[PDB]
Amino acid sequence: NQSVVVDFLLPTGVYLNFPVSRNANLSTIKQLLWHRAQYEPLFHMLSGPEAYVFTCINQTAEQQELEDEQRRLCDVQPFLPVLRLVAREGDRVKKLINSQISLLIGKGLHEFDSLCDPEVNDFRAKMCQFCEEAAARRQQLGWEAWLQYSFPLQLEPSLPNRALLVNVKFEGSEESFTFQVSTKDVPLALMACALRKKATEDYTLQVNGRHEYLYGSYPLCQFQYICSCLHSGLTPHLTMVHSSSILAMRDLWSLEQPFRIELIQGSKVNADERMKLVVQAGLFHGNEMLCKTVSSSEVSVCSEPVWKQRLEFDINICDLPRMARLCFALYAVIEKAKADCPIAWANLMLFDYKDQLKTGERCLYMWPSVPDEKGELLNPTGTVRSNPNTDSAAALLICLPEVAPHPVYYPALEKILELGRHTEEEQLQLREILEGELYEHEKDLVWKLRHEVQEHFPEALARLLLVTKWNKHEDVAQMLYLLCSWPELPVLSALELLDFSFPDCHVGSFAIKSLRKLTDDELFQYLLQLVQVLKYESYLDCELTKFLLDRALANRKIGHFLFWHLRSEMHVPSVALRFGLILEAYCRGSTHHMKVLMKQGEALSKLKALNDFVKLSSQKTPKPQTKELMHLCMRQEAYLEALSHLQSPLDPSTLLAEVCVEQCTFMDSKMKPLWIMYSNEEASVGIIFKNGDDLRQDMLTLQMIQLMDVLWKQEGLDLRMTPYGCLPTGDRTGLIEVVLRSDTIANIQLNFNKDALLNWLKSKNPGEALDRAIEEFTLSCAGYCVATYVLGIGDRHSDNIMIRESGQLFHIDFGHFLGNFINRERVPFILTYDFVHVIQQGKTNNSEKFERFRGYCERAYTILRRHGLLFLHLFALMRAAGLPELSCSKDIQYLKDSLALGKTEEEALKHFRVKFNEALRESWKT
């Protein structure tokens, strides 16, 4: 039951075994131990209880020094119930941090040591040091840099002046100061005035019961809080927190012989014995084939097949680029006389992380080949890391041969740039071409006029890199010479060069260099794509990893979402290692945030266990019984402590304080998502814990709508959208924000009947408020009509459309996008009669209003077109995520067509109009 028998190992070699409760804190267990130890031999020899610390083997299989004795044995969760006393003394900082990391990332650091891979070890040393340094450096600076680091300003994208009554306050003081000020007032104006208002450049304003601070050179109206307060009517309640209170928070070449590879053996193969096994091999540079694909002989199907066969390639060693990858696929072929069975695949870098060409034997633990649309012999886009299941997985034994008495490395930049140095008819023939897939005759024209491309077409660098023959080192040196003198490209062009088709490390270096102009705000908008692109990297230490880490240590919000982006994929074998090494480095440099993410991951662990119970208890007792059988399981000391007082993983500046267990429920949906409510100690907020469904798809959809909202908001168009948070936290687990005062159009319609929504809106907006809500409906309708049409999100019914008490419409449960319904087809613009009605304020005909709504739809679509390449570039990088709905060229193509990307602005607007008008015509029929 509650109690558990614990083994205790005393430093005298004495052994005690007695029962204790699973909820007992370690401090309490130590006392029961000293009480029983006095009646066991060699007690006199022991030092005081406080002289010792408990040691245990945690879930992640490593020894853990259990320093915080306020932890319950249940929260410690040791492998077997074994505790060992050890002398406290040593570096009880690295011992403490290393342990917390292993728990937090859900992988023991020992797994990294076990590998005996220097690449892993060098990454760890360099990255942990860079981070540790940046953290130490962070600690040096004063309150202004720190408040900028931990609580970065949450501002509106960006106008009149208005009267604003603002309720000021002070630290500890329960005495308010309702002082009114100008909409365009700087922070000091709202500050020192209230300091002068109390008496008759120190401190900053803080939003009550939030980690949101008002500071810096900006007008009040430009701050999300003030801004939302103005719109929702409500008066902003600030607090003056002194500098003292903030500080308290603060504390050579030659080899002209061919490329040779010795396919020695295969291992643990699981194929039909009737068949024959073949190993197909190719050489690649990104997506491009570096030469013809050599194949092995057929050998009979067995577990350990032997080939001991030499494979030569139509590429001479000195021609192999830095990023050359050897790709393998094992096939089960029906011996020569209807489909060739793809067994497994494996990719390998021809050069190591230190520029040295790999020699000797290699045992490549292989990944299963997934049967798909692109049959493809090989998988060059696949990961270069070995299948971590070295245990039960198939493998291939290869041997790259020695080719010199001394090891050979790829040339240095100086020896590359050395070799690299050095008409009006064709000048037109370059303009016509540079105005995606260039034809081989056009390719050579671009390469010949490559200096003309650098001089007059710098934005066509991507086009130039793809025409380059990466299988001829002469051609590579030439390109690289121009690269090292190329003008800095805009963020938009740089985003394109992050994709798998640009594997050269010099390319990646240029791409990051141009991405260094990004404000924390715009960076946050691409963060998900940038994390995804790490899956296309060849080596652990790369420019993108370093960039992503620099940014995360410079901004806390970025660091937080970078943590969850990597954390939520710690289950995927392909990324576990890479992501794990980034998370350790991030943690080492963000020890403060480590404490927050620890609290969050803990509550998350409880919710998975709580949800798991409810899921089961649904297939037993009825819903109100389960509800009450959930409230007792929640009110357990440990459950309630873990679920209380934490920063929200969805928005770390939101303080989820006291759980309202009475208000906590679950949803009658498939995966039974938990409805968890909280109340404000100083400032309501709720979270939805869903486990079972993949949330990546929904987060990308929501991120894009938010991007659209920012792009629209930037050009003075506020379409009153609801960018509710959705965050994947783990394996088929995530959180979804609670939008209070909202209901699904199906539920609203069942409580005239054509006026069912208008009555609901009337019952939530009386008199003067009715006209406000319809403008909220009109504005949100347009935005979501345009959004869902552009993204190809179909199946838009009343169970997946929601209305807010303010009048704002918004979409939920985006199951599929890009025309997919399983089967991708062009989703038309959809005008719903029910909505068209509310827009017309109840009338049959009201073009006065309806045409204004037409304008919102039309300008929303027009703005999206202006940023069409952004969405294509972003979506093209998302192909690294491996979502079925976003796996190829035709998925990204959807966007080109939806946004009429090809067609002129006028040609696009007239087709949008035709589609709009027919959505209104077909609206009537439904």
Ligand SMILES: CC(=O)N1CCN(c2cccc(-c3cc(-c4ccnn4CC(F)(F)F)c4c(N)ncnn34)c2)C(=O)C1(C)C
């Ligand atoms: C108080 C209470 O116990 N309620 C009332 C809310 N409710 C309900 C109904 C219809 C839609 C949504 C719903 C779905 C989503 C939603 C948005 C995106 N995905 N989802 C569903 C998901 F959370 F499961 F993912 C959201 C949301 N973000 N905020 C508020 N309600 N809400 C909730 C309920 O079933 C119960 C559980 C009966």
